[PDB]
């Protein structure tokens, strides 16, 4: 997979590495799940999320 196509499948940030290798990353306040692509918040108020809508 490559980052320039479809964001490399990553939810957030994407790095290309030497080989057919791709690493996804997450912003501060998020951690990467075992799927290697998804980011889940690790803090109460992660950037770019709207609390009143996240609560619903």
């Amino acid at each position: 997979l490559i980052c320039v196509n479809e964001n490399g499948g990553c939810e957030q940030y994407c790095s290309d590495h030497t080989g057919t290798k791709r690493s996804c990353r997450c912003h501060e306040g998020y951690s990467l799940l075992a799927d290697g692509v998804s980011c889940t918040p690790t803090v109460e108020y992660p950037c770019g999320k709207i609390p009143i809508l996240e609560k619903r």
């Binding site: 950037c47 999320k49 009143i52």
Partner: protein, 250 residues
């Protein structure tokens, strides 16, 4: 903002209001607890640098509801390449004197990596612009925070569809050429925010145009992707005496 709607309270939690001697100056975007991104041109006529205030959690300018948080602006950092009275490199990074407290009504917008922003965010068609600027060209400013969804144009298409200063690689156009919907003067420095897979990111800064919602013309926004490494480096730096700092760009 012309042609938008009230941003429901708490739904634009990264929006900053900048004041100078208590008067409305510009907007901005919170990107973490002590840093705000705005437009360089907002500071072209500042006399007392020590009376700049940033307000977070603001919504309705007519009332105080307790969610508002005010901070003094300790530093205004502008790239070396910005020339006052002109349009290019229209960005400022503001350090608050004390962090704001994150709450349901005060949340930073994510500053994206450059690659993610250039390769992915830049192809998201619509994004939100917001502020307490003029509701009409030559009209009164808004008392409640307004927001507008605007589509982004490739620069070749903007130039072809427009009928000014140059649209540089440090800019992009967004909005509508039919005179119905635009950001305006008083929105300057505010966010152009782009959603991607459940999260919002800073992609633009309200910068300039030819009158607000002028038929034949689009809003022009500072292309934040060009400045990610510049901003990141500055956020790791120690504060310096004196409010204004000109910092080399690149």
């Amino acid at each position: 903002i012309v042609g938008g709607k009230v941003c429901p309270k708490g739904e634009c939690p990264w929006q900053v209001l900048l004041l100078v001697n208590g008067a409305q100056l510009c907007g901005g975007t919170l990107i973490n607890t002590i840093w705000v991104v705005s437009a360089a041109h907002c500071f072209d006529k500042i006399k007392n640098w020590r009376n700049l205030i940033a307000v977070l959690g603001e919504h309705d300018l007519s009332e105080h509801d307790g969610d508002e948080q005010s901070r003094r602006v300790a530093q205004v950092i502008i790239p070396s390449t910005y020339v006052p009275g002109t349009t290019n490199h229209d960005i400022a990074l503001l350090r608050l004197h004390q962090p704001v407290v994150l709450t349901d009504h005060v949340v930073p917008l994510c500053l994206p990596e450059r690659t993610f922003s250039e390769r992915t965010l830049a192809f998201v068609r619509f994004s939100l612009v917001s502020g307490w600027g003029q509701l009409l060209d030559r009209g009164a400013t808004a008392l409640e925070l307004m927001v507008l969804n605007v589509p982004r144009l490739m620069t070749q298409d903007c130039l072809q569809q427009s009928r000014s200063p140059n649209i540089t690689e440090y800019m992009f156009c967004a909005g509508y050429s039919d005179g119905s919907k635009d950001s305006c003067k008083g929105d300057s420095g505010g966010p152009h925010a782009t959603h991607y897979r459940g999260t919002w990111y800073l992609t633009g800064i309200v910068s300039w145009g030819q009158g607000c919602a002028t038929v034949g013309h689009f809003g022009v926004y500072t292309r934040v992707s060009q400045y990610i490494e510049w901003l990141q480096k500055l956020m790791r730096s120690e504060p310096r005496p004196g409010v204004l700092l000109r910092a080399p760009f690149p």
